[PDB]
Design a protein around this nucleic acid. Structure first.
Lengths: 51, 58, 99, 193, 148, 203
RNA sequence: UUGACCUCAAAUCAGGUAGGAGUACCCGCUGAACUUAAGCAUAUCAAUAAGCGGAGGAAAAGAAACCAACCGGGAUUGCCUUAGUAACGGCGAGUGAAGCGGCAAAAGCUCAAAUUUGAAAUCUGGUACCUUCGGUGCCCGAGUUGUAAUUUGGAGAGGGCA
RNA sequence: UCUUUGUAAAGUGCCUUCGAAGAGUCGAGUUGUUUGGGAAUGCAGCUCUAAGUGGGUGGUAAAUUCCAUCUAAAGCUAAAU
């Protein structure tokens, strides 16, 4: 009966999700996370629905 | 039930009834309804009369 | 028997239209039946009275209704039951006098 | 034992509480199992809605009688008014509650209308017919939602007649408080010559 | 996190922050609220006066639903009506169209007069009302009708 | 119907006729064995009412059980504890004499399942009951859909588990505000109220 | 003495059934003390451990002699809450539920007490056959001190009209 | 797939007369135990021991009016657990 799951405010979770979505678009943050997107044309990268 | 609506023309009550409470009221009920009743001897006789072993009333 | 439309007072509550539902047959349970009266009178015809009931009848005859009710409150459980039993022993006395 | 300025805490843990500890690790698994049971039961009763039709009922106490919720079953008066017998109602999917009494005209009307529209919407397959497969819906509760009845319009005219609504409350409470005294006084005044 | 605790910092020092003279013993003062009248009476009297004894009447089988009665003040009264309609009503502040406010539907039992509603008329459907609350609604030009 | 008359007459307990019958019958039952098979119910109406039907596979066993409190079975009255538990004499057994009688009868006729039992007599030292039992392996009971539930396995030793009428009465199984401690099982209720329920996302 | 009946026995009579095990959970009985109270006796630990009896895949409970006081809910169970609250308590240490509400699941019912009385309509067993978890004939038996059909309070029964 | 049986079985509308409903039990006193249950929550022993618009309950003992709500002293029952 040690605590395993931790409650987080819904709005705080969504705040963090929005920050992560926004950081997706930042070129420097993706490089810092190390995602080898240098030869990508531009980010946030978008493709057609054929994908 | 027959006595209670006076459809009985004669009632015969066996004296040999083991739990006497089954027939103690029969004389008083017969008197109240005004039917003729006789305390006859032997529930075995009534059983023989109705082709059974014991009948305790006919 | 309608409410007063006010949250305070004797008949407090919302004013609504009432339709007085059909009584359930559960509510007719204490009711007396011809069958059970006939059977109970017939059983009394052969059972007789209890020792404390004869004591009650003698107490009503000699001592009085109050003393009988006290003894019947002792013998039965409650005061209401004592009143009812003394009433029925009064009925027995009256029936004896009448016939 | 007792220490700095702190609230007095009442922690009931001086039995063998550690033996009776239930940790709900199976919350997710139980949710999955419940959804699976609902799915398999729906498949078993495939054309049927997986639940029964419940009545509109007024919540009992003075804290909740402002709200209307679901009941247990429709009264025998309600089913008779809807025009069907209790046994058949039970077979074709209406919850019938025998011990609930309706003293209320608008709860009566709301439940009868619930039953009428239920009969209008559902279709009963005949015992020996051709089985018109009918695209089961899975929730009578969602198909026939409980709607709180509106009481009065949002904007109406102001009627003042000078009672302040506080003196009336005070006087009602006082009349309740002193009714028995006044009745007793009337009895003594009548009985004394 | 255990790595942040002071046990990790006491690793190395003999007594673990509990003292050399007065050790960390088991229960040197008693268990729980022991000795509240005898040797913790000073803490009890300083920090929790009124602890010991009983004062009022009893109430067998008390129901809290009987005493459910949330209170609404006049300042918060106007927040019961929908926000988009609020400017409309304030501008069309007149009789014969006043908004009826069902405090009982909103979840309140009594109306209290915390004061200063605008001088528009308004219909306050309550089941209990304060003297000053009814006075202030009447002054504003509305009315309170009692409900149940 | 004679059963109505039997019922009212049996209610009239202190009437002279029932006093006489009580005396003679209590002497007879005292003279017979402590537990003995009865050829027929001595209260036909009461057996019928409690569930007995006069068909093959229904048994009546008369049983007498000793009256009084339960003396604590300790040597020389030594309890070795607190003065509260020092009592020996006027402690009361928590199950009724009816339940004790029907449990003894079930132990005797282990093949049968007790339907019920009813009071027939008592005296200073003994109380007398008649136990209705059903033969669950008789075909007249296995067929005849009115009584298969007794031959279903979950009804083994209802008297021992407390599922008979007196068992429910003793266990306190009844609806109301007076049975809040014992309504669905005393120990079940106690476990439920003394469990600490901790969810994944703690409250 | 033509033979019954009742009660009680005996059979290596015909066919069955119970016992023991496991016992995590479940249904009861029985039942402590250590411990806490900074001592200790009521209290607490605890209606717990140990002991005993009895089940199942769940058990138990269960269709109100319920809850309520409302504009009334409507079998039981479990969860969130009520609530560490009402209350109990050397009113000390401590203990301590329930109604309403939101949910999960929802399912209802049958006996006794009624004359079939124009027909004991009921059932075990033996024997025979068959399509053998059984069905159908005959025969004893059980049973009127009551086995079938009908009724269970939500009703229902009887008799008329439709 | 054969199996019509069966003027067989069940449900509904109106009216009339009825409408049986569980006893050493409810209940009361007292004793022990138990409960949060407090002039006594349940259980058990003992004593007393009913009634039929009766009985129970309505968390302060009692006597007088009412009212509200169920219908014990018999029984079965899946699921959630």
């Amino acid at each position: 009966w040690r605590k395993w799951n931790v409650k987080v405010n819904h709005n705080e979770k969504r705040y963090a999700t929005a920050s992560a979505i926004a950081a997706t678009a930042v070129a420097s943050l993706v490089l810092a996370r190390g995602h080898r997107v240098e030869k990508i044309p531009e980010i946030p990268l978008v493709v057609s629905t054929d994908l | 039930a027959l006595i209670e609506n006076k459809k009985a023309k004669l009632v015969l009550i066996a004296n040999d009834v083991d739990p006497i409470e089954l027939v103690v009221f029969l004389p008083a009920l017969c008197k109240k309804m005004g039917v003729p009743y006789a305390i006859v001897k032997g529930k075995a006789r009534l059983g023989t009369l109705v082709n059974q072993k014991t009948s305790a009333v006919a | 028997t309608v409410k007063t439309g006010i949250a305070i007072g004797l008949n407090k509550g919302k004013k609504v239209t009432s339709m007085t539902p059909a009584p359930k047959i559960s509510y007719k349970k204490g009711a007396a039946s011809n069958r059970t009266k006939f059977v109970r009178s017939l059983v009394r015809e052969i059972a007789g009275l209890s020792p404390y009931e004869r004591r009650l009848i003698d107490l009503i005859r000699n001592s009085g209704e109050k003393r009988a009710r006290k003894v019947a409150k002792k013998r039965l459980g409650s005061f209401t039951r004592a009143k009812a039993k003394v009433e029925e022993m009064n009925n027995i006395i009256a029936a004896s006098r009448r016939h | 034992a007792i220490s700095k300025n702190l609230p007095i805490l009442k922690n009931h843990f001086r039995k063998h509480w550690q033996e009776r500890v239930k940790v709900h690790f199976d919350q997710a698994g139980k949710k999955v199992s419940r959804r699976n049971a609902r799915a398999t039961r729906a498949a078993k009763i495939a054309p049927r809605p997986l639940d029964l039709l419940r009545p509109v009922v007024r919540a009992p106490t003075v804290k909740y009688n402002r709200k209307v919720r679901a009941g247990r079953g429709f009264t025998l008066a309600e089913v008779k008014a809807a025009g069907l017998t209790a046994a058949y109602a039970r077979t074709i999917g209406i919850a019938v509650d025998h011990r609930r009494q309706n003293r209320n005209q608008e709860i009566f009307d709301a439940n009868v209308q619930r039953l009428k529209e239920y009969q209008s919407k559902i279709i009963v397959f005949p015992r020996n017919g051709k089985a018109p497969e009918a695209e089961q819906v899975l929730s009578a509760a969602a198909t026939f939602p409980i709607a709180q009845p509106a009481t009065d319009v949002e904007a109406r005219a102001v009627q003042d007649n000078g009672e302040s609504a506080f003196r009336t409350l005070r006087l009602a409470r006082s009349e309740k408080k002193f009714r028995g005294i006044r009745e007793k006084r009337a009895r003594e005044k009548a009985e004394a010559e | 996190p255990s790595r942040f605790t002071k046990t990790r910092k006491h690793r190395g020092h003999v007594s673990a922050g509990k003292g050399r003279i007065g050790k960390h013993r088991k229960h040197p003062g008693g268990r729980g609220m022991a000795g509240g009248q005898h040797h913790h009476r000073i803490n009890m009297d300083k920090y929790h006066p009124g602890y010991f004894g009983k004062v009022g009447m009893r109430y067998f089988h008390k129901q809290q639903a009987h005493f459910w009665k949330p209170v609404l003040n006049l300042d918060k009264l106007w927040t019961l009506i929908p926000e988009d309609k609020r400017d409309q009503y304030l501008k069309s502040a007149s009789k014969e169209t006043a908004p009826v406010i069902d405090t009982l539907a909103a979840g309140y039992g009594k109306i209290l007069g915390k004061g200063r509603i605008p001088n528009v008329p308004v219909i306050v459907k309550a089941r209990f009302v304060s003297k000053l609350a009814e006075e202030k609604i009447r002054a504003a030009g509305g009315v309170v009708e009692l409900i149940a | 119907g004679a059963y109505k008359y039997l019922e009212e007459l049996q209610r009239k307990k202190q009437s002279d006729v029932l006093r006489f019958l009580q005396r003679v019958r209590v002497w007879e039952y005292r003279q017979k064995n402590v537990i003995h098979r009865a050829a027929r119910p001595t209260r036909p109406d009461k057996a019928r009412r409690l569930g007995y039907k006069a068909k093959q596979g229904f048994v009546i066993y008369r049983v007498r059980v000793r009256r009084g409190n339960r003396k604590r079975p300790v040597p020389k009255g030594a309890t070795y504890g607190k003065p509260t538990n020092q009592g020996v004499n006027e402690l009361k057994y928590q199950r009724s004499l009816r339940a004790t009688a029907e449990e003894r009868v079930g132990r005797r006729a282990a093949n049968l399942r007790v339907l019920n039992s009813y009071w027939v007599n008592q005296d200073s030292t003994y109380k007398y009951f008649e136990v209705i039992l059903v033969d669950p392996q008789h075909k007249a009971i296995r067929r005849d859909a009115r009584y298969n539930w007794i031959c279903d396995p979950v009804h083994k030793h209802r008297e021992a588990r407390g599922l008979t009428a007196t068992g429910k009465k003793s266990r306190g199984i009844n609806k109301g505000h007076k049975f809040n401690n014992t309504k669905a099982g005393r120990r079940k209720t106690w476990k439920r109220q003394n469990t600490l329920s901790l969810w994944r996302y703690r409250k």
